[PDB]
Amino acid sequence: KARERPQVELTFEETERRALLLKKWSLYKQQERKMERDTIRAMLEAQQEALEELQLESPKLHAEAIKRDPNLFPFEKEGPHYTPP
Amino acid sequence: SPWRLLGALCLQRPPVVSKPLTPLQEEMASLLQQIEIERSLYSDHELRALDENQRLAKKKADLAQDLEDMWEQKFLQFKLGARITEADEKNDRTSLNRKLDRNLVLLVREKFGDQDVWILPQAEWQPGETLRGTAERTLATLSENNMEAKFLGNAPCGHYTFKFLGAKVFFFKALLLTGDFSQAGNKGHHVWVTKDELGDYLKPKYLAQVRRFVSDL
Amino acid sequence: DSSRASLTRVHRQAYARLYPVLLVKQDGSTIHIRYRRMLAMP
Amino acid sequence: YKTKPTHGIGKYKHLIKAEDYEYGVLNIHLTAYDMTLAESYAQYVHNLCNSLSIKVEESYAMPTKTILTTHERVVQISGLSATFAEIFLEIIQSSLPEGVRLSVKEHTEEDFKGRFKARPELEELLAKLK
RNA sequence: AGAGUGUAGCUUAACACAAAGCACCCAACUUACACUUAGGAGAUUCAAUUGACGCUCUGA
């Protein structure tokens, strides 16, 4: 049921605080996503320029350089711990 | 002109600990915690605590607080690992446990015949030997350890052509899973670099852009 | 940016209150988990 | 009209299809004991691959496993170039919140599920097989 | 050191009454996505067509 805390009454200054927090959060997340977009674009263009230079230097290497590898299929990543073991 | 056949490996270690929070994050964390408290429905612990305490009080007139108390005490009893292990050395570049919240890379100081500069680990690739194979060869030979590295992709993360006989260097990314390093104080000048140290160490303009193909994270 | 993505609001309307408990089985590596203060398994 | 130059001006369903080394369907598995974190990262990986113009088959859920129950969420990912896939997996490993597992086991022929097709789809399929 | 130059991501948008239109992010619904609703952040590199601050390629 919902008899635990049926009453939910808060002040006005807290609403103002909440609004400011949400506005700041929106700005922050926009900035963070901008950083992500910048880094991925930089990485992609780095890949492109390296590959193009490889084409010019050696016509042989790119064939194996674009080739898939089976070992990637069963990949596992270890998540970060709040304390070292 | 014949080209100097060189392949470079870039090794990255995942952060052991999460990055420290911003004031904004923590205040919003408190805000969502408040929201969670507000919008909960019929929590069993609160029924076991508050209402039971009231009933027992009425009965006595004619406990879960203590439970929380000894829970907290035994929580305090159990020692937790220090997040700040960094503070002990603050000067050691040869330590895997230098930084826990950041991504770190190996950098080797070698005295080349024509140049005296920091150089990321290299391999001489023969026509027979693949770039991948030489990457594992780099991991095995000049490291002198039991590093296990996962090779992400054969695609070159970076490439630079530097001239004083053409010279070419190709950088590939590898991810460290599990490894034990013996003889830390070896002849090899190995340095763990987070993000900032590579800029200072790599004085040439060509190498200065290593940061372009490595995530700051 | 682990902590950046760690922040999340609850989407489920019908749920019981959860507490940020710390999980230390035997490894010693603590984890913040929303759960109904220590975790142990034989 | 056929003779007129304005013939086939109202052709519409040539534009819609109501039916290079490419990886198989990556079923990315995210497990955490905290349901909230798993759901969050599922949403994150979804909108990320959406922004990177990567095809998604399904983001379905499977029943919870009893142990302190562990929560699991899967997303189906396809349309990855090798060089692009490299960047993709490094992104998804970097921004991992707290101890959520990443199983990137690919879809196999034996583990195949056929969806309940709609009336137009079945009619189209019948027309083709006729 | 030379050349090419120049509006938030994009646009031979900007005669003017004007720095505009898509992109982008957060919150609600959605397991999700998407739609919708409710909010947020944005720029003419500086001085008089010209000169010098940022960017890309060529020298060691």
From Swiss-Prot, chain A:
A GO molecular function held by the record: RNA binding
Tissue spec: Ubiquitous.
GO annotation, cellular component aspect: mitochondrial inner membrane; mitochondrial large ribosomal subunit; mitochondrial ribosome; mitochondrion; nucleolus; nucleus
Origin superkingdom: Eukaryota
Main localisation: mitochondrion
UniProtKB keywords: Mitochondrion, Ribonucleoprotein, Ribosomal protein, Transit peptide
UniProt-annotated location(s): Mitochondrion
Keyword Ribosomal protein: yes
Entry annotated with the keyword Protease: no
One record GO biological process: anatomical structure morphogenesis
Quaternary structure note: Component of the mitochondrial large ribosomal subunit (mt-LSU). Mature mammalian 55S mitochondrial ribosomes consist of a small (28S) and a large (39S) subunit. The 28S small subunit contains a 12S ribosomal RNA (12S mt-rRNA) and 30 different proteins. The 39S large subunit contains a 16S rRNA (16S mt-rRNA), a copy of mitochondrial valine transfer RNA (mt-tRNA(Val)), which plays an integral structural role, and 52 different proteins. mL40 binds to the major groove of the anticodon stem of mt-tRNA(Val) in the central protuberance.
Family: Belongs to the mitochondrion-specific ribosomal protein mL40 family.
Name of the molecule in the record: Large ribosomal subunit protein mL40
Species classification: Eukaryota, Metazoa, Chordata, Craniata, Vertebrata
Gene it is expressed from: MRPL40
Portion of the parent chain present: 97 to 181 of 206
From Swiss-Prot, chain B:
N6-acetyllysine, modified sites: 168
Keyword terms, alphabetized: Acetylation, Mitochondrion, Ribonucleoprotein, Ribosomal protein, Transit peptide
Gene Ontology molecular functions: structural constituent of ribosome
Compartments (UniProt record): Mitochondrion
GO CC terms of this entry: cell junction; cytosol; mitochondrial inner membrane; mitochondrial large ribosomal subunit; mitochondrion; nucleoplasm
GO biological process: mitochondrial translation
Location, primary (coarse class): mitochondrion
Subunit and interaction comment: Component of the mitochondrial large ribosomal subunit (mt-LSU). Mature mammalian 55S mitochondrial ribosomes consist of a small (28S) and a large (39S) subunit. The 28S small subunit contains a 12S ribosomal RNA (12S mt-rRNA) and 30 different proteins. The 39S large subunit contains a 16S rRNA (16S mt-rRNA), a copy of mitochondrial valine transfer RNA (mt-tRNA(Val)), which plays an integral structural role, and 52 different proteins. mL46 is located at the central protuberance.
Homology family: Belongs to the mitochondrion-specific ribosomal protein mL46 family.
Name of the protein in its database record: Large ribosomal subunit protein mL46
Originating species: Homo sapiens (Human)
Source species taxonomy: Eukaryota, Metazoa, Chordata, Craniata, Vertebrata
Gene: MRPL46
Range of the intact protein held here: 43 to 279 of 279
UniProtKB/Swiss-Prot annotation, chain C:
Encoding gene, per UniProt annotation: MRPL55
Taxonomic lineage: Eukaryota, Metazoa, Chordata, Craniata, Vertebrata
Entry's localization field: Mitochondrion
Highest taxon, organism lineage: Eukaryota
UniProt name for this protein: Large ribosomal subunit protein mL55
Family: Belongs to the mitochondrion-specific ribosomal protein mL55 family.
Organism: Homo sapiens (Human)
Subunit structure: Component of the mitochondrial large ribosomal subunit (mt-LSU). Mature mammalian 55S mitochondrial ribosomes consist of a small (28S) and a large (39S) subunit. The 28S small subunit contains a 12S ribosomal RNA (12S mt-rRNA) and 30 different proteins. The 39S large subunit contains a 16S rRNA (16S mt-rRNA), a copy of mitochondrial valine transfer RNA (mt-tRNA(Val)), which plays an integral structural role, and 52 different proteins.
From Swiss-Prot, chain D:
Any GO CC annotation of this UniProt entry: mitochondrial large ribosomal subunit
Signal peptide region: none
GO BP term (any one): mitochondrial translation
Modification N6-succinyllysine occurs at: 117
Keyword annotations of the record: Mitochondrion, Ribonucleoprotein, Ribosomal protein, Transit peptide
Compartments reported by the entry: Mitochondrion
First-listed, main subcellular location of the protein, grouped into a coarse class: mitochondrion
Top-rank lineage group of the source organism: Eukaryota
Complex formation: Component of the mitochondrial large ribosomal subunit (mt-LSU). Mature mammalian 55S mitochondrial ribosomes consist of a small (28S) and a large (39S) subunit. The 28S small subunit contains a 12S ribosomal RNA (12S mt-rRNA) and 30 different proteins. The 39S large subunit contains a 16S rRNA (16S mt-rRNA), a copy of mitochondrial valine transfer RNA (mt-tRNA(Val)), which plays an integral structural role, and 52 different proteins. mL48 is located at the central protuberance. Interacts with OXA1L.
Membership in a protein family: Belongs to the mitochondrion-specific ribosomal protein mL48 family.
Name of the protein this chain belongs to: Large ribosomal subunit protein mL48
Coverage span on the entire protein: 48 to 212 of 212
